[PDB]
Amino acid sequence: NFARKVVEENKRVKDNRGRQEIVLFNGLTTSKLRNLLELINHVYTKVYNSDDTTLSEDVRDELEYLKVKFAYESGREPAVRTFIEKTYVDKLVDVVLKKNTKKIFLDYCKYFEALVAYAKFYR
Amino acid sequence: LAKTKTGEMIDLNFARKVVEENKRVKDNRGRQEIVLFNGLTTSKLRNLLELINHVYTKVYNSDDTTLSEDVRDELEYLKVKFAYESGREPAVRTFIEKTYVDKLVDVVLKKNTKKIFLDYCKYFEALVAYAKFYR
Amino acid sequence: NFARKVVEENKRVKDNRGRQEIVLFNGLTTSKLRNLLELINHVYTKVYNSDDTTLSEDVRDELEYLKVKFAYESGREPAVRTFIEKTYVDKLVDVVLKKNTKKIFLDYCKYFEALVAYAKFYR
Amino acid sequence: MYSKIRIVGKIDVLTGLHIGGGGETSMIGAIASPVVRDPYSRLPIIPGSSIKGKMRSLLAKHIGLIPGQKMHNQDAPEILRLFGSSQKGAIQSSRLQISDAFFSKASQEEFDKKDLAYTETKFENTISRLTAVANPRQIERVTRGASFDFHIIYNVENINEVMADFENIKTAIHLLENDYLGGGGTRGNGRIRFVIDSIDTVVGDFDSSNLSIK
Amino acid sequence: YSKIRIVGKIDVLTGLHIGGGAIASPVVRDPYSRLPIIPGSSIKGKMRSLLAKHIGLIPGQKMHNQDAPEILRLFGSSQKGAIQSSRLQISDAFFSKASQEEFDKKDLAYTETKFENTISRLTAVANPRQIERVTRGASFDFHIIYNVENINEVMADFENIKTAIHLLENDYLGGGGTRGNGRIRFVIDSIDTVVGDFDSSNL
Amino acid sequence: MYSKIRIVGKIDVLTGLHIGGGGETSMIGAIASPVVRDPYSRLPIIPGSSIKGKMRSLLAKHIGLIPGQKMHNQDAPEILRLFGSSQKGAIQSSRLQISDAFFSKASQEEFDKKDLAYTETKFQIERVTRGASFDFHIIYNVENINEVMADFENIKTAIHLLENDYLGGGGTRGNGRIRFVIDSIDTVVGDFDSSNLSIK
RNA sequence: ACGAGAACAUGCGCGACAUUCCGAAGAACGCUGAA
């Protein structure tokens, strides 16, 4: 899939004191992505429990705030922002908003889950 | 939320557009310096963030959907502090004039709801987050 | 009998502890495989219900999600990673996606059933 | 004239329903107790024998059981008349024939939507009274959204007893809704509700329009 | 033979964790609505254990069905030759629609994540852990059926049931209840004899 | 008789209490640490696990700890009797059930007055204001009749230890001091006599 | 003007009873509002 290729292009085997860090980026860590993952999980639970074929307005506002969180974590951790540039998550958010359905949102959430899953698998 | 001049709608992408407008290369000694709102520094925008979050906390202390009276008074004091901070520093003045925060908080006072206050503060948070991001 | 071959090749005994215990794939249990085998059961029911020689689009997307689940399970537990790498089950998933027929997925399900059955046998 | 009255409706599960049976599936789980399934469709099923047995037991207990009963032929005369008897020299046919209840098409569609499995794997345990250690156990159940199409045939052998028979059937159904269907029902499983779609005399000149069971 | 019904509400005074198959530590959720649920097995097991503790205990009840005869009468037995049908039939308690709408009015999730650091003794290095819990103030509507196998035993059985509920309100319901989890409170709506002619007005 | 005793009272903060927890909120400050808050009331909350773990560690260190321990199940037998034991072959249910201490409504009214925020910021971390109080409720399950008084003496010792110590956060830097006040200790279930039972 | 003709392998039957995903586990430590 796209996520696997993106992560394997991202991944790098650095050598420090004999030990090997098989890491996408030096600053990438599960919690830094996990904050946005928690927000994604909240909004995904909202859409996945409400059972609406079209994304609700509150969910759209949640996605706007999700873009805000993208920018905020970009400001804090440069690793998160270069990951976002590599993975174009914000562009997928914009596409999801434009489609304004739950199917595209589910596909995007699966794409993000694939990204984090491949990151865990290689790391 | 509110409607900007020339028919622009106040949104988070609007905040992104505004912060993109505010930034310049500012190349000094062969190296660029990312200047936001006439070179507004992180400390002052974070102080403004803390001022906003004071009202945020005092309104989250209440479960009422409408703005509380003391919340509205603190918002008016926020307007006064915004005016004086605009007066003190040209960078803060540029920030306030490009963000219309006084007009937005006046609209919030007229609407008198928690949701509109949250939307305005979310716009402000988007502004500061994008400012720190582009820097 | 590829299934029995790989299970017996990866079959091992806890000789280090000095107490008799059979270890499959460096500590694999059915509990580790529970989530992925339940997902495969879901896909199997979905394909059985449909009357079509070739796999449908929902089946293909669910199989891509199954590949992602294989990667995530490999990341979470070393035992599942050993099982997947030695059994080439994800590569067979890719082969099934290439073939795109109901029969090839039925045969893949047969192979996985043989894998888990022989693993339970040799324990 | 032989009159057969058809009662067709839905059996909504209100909790996880586990009617055990010898099960086979792909990647057989650690569960030692899989639900019964209709092999042609692999969907879970409610065997009509389970419904008939539970209803007959509840109705017989309601009517009252003869002390020291060794057989099901020693029940009350109403129970034998309705559910059938096998006593030597006094064989009474079963007026009530309770077919198997298949997984509904509506619930199948509603579970194809939402990407949900028709069954679920409830994880239980059993804290021992001595070692205070939990032994994990897994039970396969049918999710509470599912419904089953149920079909019952009543045979009108005696015309004058039909109203009393349907009173007893209504009592049995009312007991069953408050009771559980086949499973670990004393621990919450198997709760049921009957929604009768129709009660029409499919055969015979008899009319059951005034006849109701719920 | 009569069936008495006891419907009511269970309110979570604290977080309620009932496990079921990053570190989510998932709580048992009803697959249909994906909402949290209190399994009836958990309620029945906790009530039976608490009541068996209240009454005397033989040294080893390893068979688990050799409790005091009141326990077997209420919750059922399986001893060889003497199988007593369980009069109490607890049911799975689903997420109340009133509480669901109350949470949806706010920006509140039905399940919270509680962080526990699990600090060690010799190393003193905290080990992160996250437990999923049902948020405080949620309600589950519970439905219990009692069958009057014998008429003369009903008052004693309901006294035992009320003692069990009194114990359970002072205890937790699954999860790490010994460190602030699973605490519940029962509010009974209506104890009415659904089937039969037994007089349930008193109880 | 499996009798259950109840202790209900209050915990009055004395410094800026800080118990961390992973969460985010709209208009969250640039502080590096938020406090754990009850999601329903959005008020700061003291998890019961914090109190139980703090008292367990304090008791273990005060009574005397065996060197080289790797697991919590290797504490003193009294400690395992009180706070539980998962030791394989010696599983012991805990006689202590400590519940989450929520923000008391009296302190909620006090902070509603004077427009005092529940949590302040120290230069940054978020800390619970000194005047706040959290109502605590713990349950003791009587399993051995003779050992109840000894267990309650141990509980009193743990409460005294925590009273002069901190609860979470940077206690050595002045964040966490609290005090315990007891309303009533009554045998809520059973026939045990708890009139002469105190934890302070 | 078939070792033939007429003759339901049928009748009663709950895959059911007993069973807490529990027992333990601090969101953590050392971090000056300051040149």
| Inter-chain contacts counted by CB atoms under 8 A, chains D and F | 6
- Check: CB of residue E47 under 8 Å from CB of residue E34: no
This entry's atomic model was obtained through cryo-EM
Interface list for chain E against chain F, based on CB atoms closer than 8 Å: 13-15, 50, 53-54, 108-109, 112-116, 119-122, 130, 135-137, 166-167, 170-172, 176-181, 183
- The residues, ordered by sequence, that sit 6+ positions from D16 with a Cβ below 8 Å of its Cβ are D120, D122, D139, D141, D142, D143, D144, D183, D188, D189, D190, E92
Q: Which residues of E are less than 8 Å from A48 in CB distance?
A: 34
Helix (H, G, I), strand (E, B) or coil at D73: helix
CA E100, distance to chain mean position in Å, is: 20
Instruction: Give contacts of B 48-67 with F, CB under 8 A.
Output: 49-50, 52-53, 56-58, 60-61
Q: Does A113 touch chain C (CB under 8 A)?
A: yes
Nucleotide nearest to D33 (CA to C1'): G15
* Encoded tokens for F5: 């005793």
Helix (H, G, I), strand (E, B) or coil at D98: strand
Distance (Å) of CA B121 to CA B118, B124, B127, B128: 5, 5, 10, 11
Q: Which residues of B are less than 8 Å from A72 in CB distance?
A: 125, 129, 132-133
What is the helix (H) or strand (E) element at residue E59, kind and residue range?
Answer: none
Nucleotide nearest to D179 (CA to C1'): G14
* Encoded tokens for B118: 């949250």
Distance between CA F79 and CA D181 in Å, rounded?
47
Smallest Cβ–Cβ distance between E34 and the set A34, A38, A48 belongs to A48
Distance between CA F13 and CA F166 in Å, rounded?
10
CA E130, distance to chain mean position in Å, is: 23
* Encoded tokens for D162: 């039909």
What does the DSSP 8-state code read for residue E28? P
Residue E64 neighbours by CB distance under 10 Å: 15
Helix (H, G, I), strand (E, B) or coil at A91: helix
* Encoded tokens for E131: 């437990």
CA atoms lying within 13 Å on the CB side of residue B20: 7
* Dihedral sign for Cα atoms in the order D114, D117, D118, D124: negative
Min distance A21 CA to chain E CA atoms (Å): 21
- Check: CB of residue B127 under 8 Å from CB of residue B19: yes
As a rounded value in angstroms, the CA-to-C1' distance for E149 and G18 is 18
Task: Name the one residue in this structure whose structure tokens are 């059933």.
Answer: C113
Helix (H, G, I), strand (E, B) or coil at D17: strand
Q: Counting Cβ atoms within 10 Å, is residue D146 exposed (0-12), middle (13-18) or buried (19+)?
A: buried
Task: Name the one residue in this structure whose structure tokens are 């509920």.
Answer: E165
What are the DSSP E strand ranges found in D95-146? 96-98, 101-103, 119-124, 137-142
Distance between CA F53 and CA C120 in Å, rounded?
41
Q: Counting Cβ atoms within 10 Å, is residue B122 exposed (0-12), middle (13-18) or buried (19+)?
A: buried
User: Quick one: CA torsion of E76, E144, E20, E49, rounded to 10 degrees?
Assistant: -40
Q: What is the 3-state secondary structure of B71-90?
A: HHHHHHHHHHHHHHHHHHCH
Nucleotide nearest to D46 (CA to C1'): G14
- The residues, ordered by sequence, that sit 6+ positions from E69 with a Cβ below 8 Å of its Cβ are none
What does the DSSP 8-state code read for residue B38? T
What does the DSSP 8-state code read for residue F34? P
Give the long-range contacts of residues D204-207, CB within 8 A, separation 24 or more.
D204/D1, D204/D2, D204/D3, D204/D4, D204/D156, D205/D1, D205/D3, D206/D1, D206/D3, D206/D5, D206/D156, D206/D159, D206/D162
Taken as a whole, chain E contains a residue count of 203
Helix (H, G, I), strand (E, B) or coil at B24: strand
Distance between CA B44 and CA C15 in Å, rounded?
66
The helix-helix angle for A102-122 and A2-10 (nearest 10°) equals 40
Distance between CA D190 and CA D187 in Å, rounded?
9
CA atoms lying within 13 Å on the CB side of residue B7: 0
- Check: CB of residue E113 under 8 Å from CB of residue E131: yes
Phi, psi of F157 (to 5 degrees): -65, -40
β-pair partners for F121: F126
B124 Ramachandran zone, left/alpha/beta (phi>0; psi -120 to 50): alpha
Distance (Å) of CA A22 to CA A12, A16, C86, D90, F166: 6, 11, 22, 82, 40
Nucleotide nearest to D84 (CA to C1'): G12
* Dihedral sign for Cα atoms in the order A48, A49, A53, A58: negative
Distance between CA B71 and CA B77 in Å, rounded?
10
* Closest to E145 in 3D by CA, of D60, D190, D120: D190
Residue D118, amino acid: Y
What is the helix (H) or strand (E) element at residue E190, kind and residue range?
Answer: strand E184-195
Please give the span between the terminal C-alpha atoms of chain D, in angstroms, as a whole number. 27
Q: Do E171 and F97 touch (CB under 8 A)?
A: yes
Please give the span between the terminal C-alpha atoms of chain F, in angstroms, as a whole number. 26
Residue E16, amino acid: L
The helix-helix angle for A30-50 and A102-122 (nearest 10°) equals 150
CA A114, distance to chain mean position in Å, is: 9
Distance between CA E184 and CA E16 in Å, rounded?
8
Using a threshold of 3 CB pairs under 8 A, tell whether chains C and B touch. Answer: no
Q: From the C1' of G12, which residue's alpha carbon is nearest?
A: D86
Helix intervals (H) in chain F: 48-63, 77-83, 105-112, 148-163
Distance between CA F52 and CA C87 in Å, rounded?
47
Nucleotide nearest to F20 (CA to C1'): G27
Min distance A50 CA to chain E CA atoms (Å): 9
Distance (Å) of CA D130 to CA A83, D126, E67, E154, F91: 54, 12, 12, 30, 10
Q: Which residues of D are less than 8 Å from F95 in CB distance?
A: none
Using a threshold of 3 CB pairs under 8 A, tell whether chains B and D touch. Answer: no
Taken as a whole, chain B contains a residue count of 135
Distance between CA E109 and CA E155 in Å, rounded?
42
Residue B74 neighbours by CB distance under 10 Å: 18
Q: Which residues of D are less than 8 Å from E150 in CB distance?
A: none
Min distance D188 CA to chain E CA atoms (Å): 4
Q: Do A38 and F26 touch (CB under 8 A)?
A: no
Distance between CA E148 and CA D62 in Å, rounded?
10
Helix (H, G, I), strand (E, B) or coil at C51: coil
Min distance D122 CA to chain E CA atoms (Å): 7
- The residues, ordered by sequence, that sit 6+ positions from E114 with a Cβ below 8 Å of its Cβ are E15, E130, E131, E132, E133, F21, F36, F47, F49
- Check: CB of residue D83 under 8 Å from CB of residue D52: yes
Distance between CA D76 and CA D78 in Å, rounded?
5
Phi, psi of F80 (to 5 degrees): -65, -35
* Encoded tokens for F173: 């830097």
As a rounded value in angstroms, the CA-to-C1' distance for D109 and G6 is 51
**DSSP for D6-36?**
EEEEEEEESS-B--B-----TT--S-S-PBP
- Check: CB of residue A116 under 8 Å from CB of residue A8: no
> Which residue precedes each gap in chain E (C to N above 2.5 Å)?
21
Distance between CA A117 and CA A121 in Å, rounded?
6
Pairing status of strand F102-103 against strand E37-38? unpaired
* Encoded tokens for E139: 């309600």
* Encoded tokens for D13: 């599960």
C69 Ramachandran zone, left/alpha/beta (phi>0; psi -120 to 50): alpha
Distance between CA D102 and CA D151 in Å, rounded?
10
* Closest to B69 in 3D by CA, of B83, B55, B89, B82: B55
Distance between CA D104 and CA F36 in Å, rounded?
47
Distance between CA B16 and CA B22 in Å, rounded?
10
Residue A105 neighbours by CB distance under 10 Å: 24
Distance between CA C31 and CA F52 in Å, rounded?
32
As a rounded value in angstroms, the CA-to-C1' distance for F80 and G24 is 9
D146 Ramachandran zone, left/alpha/beta (phi>0; psi -120 to 50): beta
User: Quick one: CA torsion of E164, E169, E170, E173, rounded to 10 degrees?
Assistant: 90
Distance between CA A51 and CA A49 in Å, rounded?
5
* Closest to D183 in 3D by CA, of E33, E47, E84, E91: E91
* Dihedral sign for Cα atoms in the order F116, F117, F123, F127: positive
Distance between CA F9 and CA F80 in Å, rounded?
25
As a rounded value in angstroms, the CA-to-C1' distance for D194 and G15 is 23
Phi, psi of A73 (to 5 degrees): -70, -25
* Encoded tokens for A56: 């609700």
* Encoded tokens for B18: 């505004």
Smallest Cβ–Cβ distance between E136 and the set F38, F60, F69 belongs to F38
β-pair partners for F35: F20
Phi, psi of E36 (to 5 degrees): -65, 155
What does the DSSP 8-state code read for residue D20? B
Helix intervals (H) in F9-164: 48-63, 77-83, 105-112, 148-163
- The residues, ordered by sequence, that sit 6+ positions from D67 with a Cβ below 8 Å of its Cβ are none
CA atoms lying within 13 Å on the CB side of residue C59: 26
Residue A88, amino acid: Y
Distance between CA F131 and CA B105 in Å, rounded?
32
* Encoded tokens for E30: 């009803």
Helix (H, G, I), strand (E, B) or coil at E33: coil
Quick one: resolution in A?
3.1
Instruction: Give contacts of A 40-99 with B, CB under 8 A.
Output: 64-65, 67-68, 71-72, 74-75, 81
Distance (Å) of CA D15 to CA D10, D143, E143: 15, 7, 11
- Cα angle: E158, vertex E160, E165; to 5 degrees: 90
What are the DSSP E strand ranges found in chain A? 12-16, 19-23
* Encoded tokens for D30: 């650690």
Residue E174 neighbours by CB distance under 10 Å: 22
Helix intervals (H) in D41-148: 48-63, 77-83, 105-112
Pairing status of strand E139-147 against strand E93-95? antiparallel
* Dihedral sign for Cα atoms in the order D113, D115, D121, D124: negative
Distance between CA E6 and CA E189 in Å, rounded?
8
Residue E161, amino acid: I
- The residues, ordered by sequence, that sit 6+ positions from E194 with a Cβ below 8 Å of its Cβ are D174, D178, E3, E4, E5
Distance between CA C112 and CA E196 in Å, rounded?
54
β-pair partners for D196: D9
* Encoded tokens for B58: 């005092």
Q: Do F29 and B61 touch (CB under 8 A)?
A: no
Distance between CA A107 and CA B7 in Å, rounded?
35
Q: Which residues of F are less than 8 Å from B61 in CB distance?
A: 111-112, 117-118
Helix intervals (H) in chain D: 48-63, 77-83, 105-112, 162-178
Distance between CA F198 and CA F153 in Å, rounded?
8
Distance between CA B117 and CA B111 in Å, rounded?
9
What is the helix (H) or strand (E) element at residue D92, kind and residue range?
Answer: none
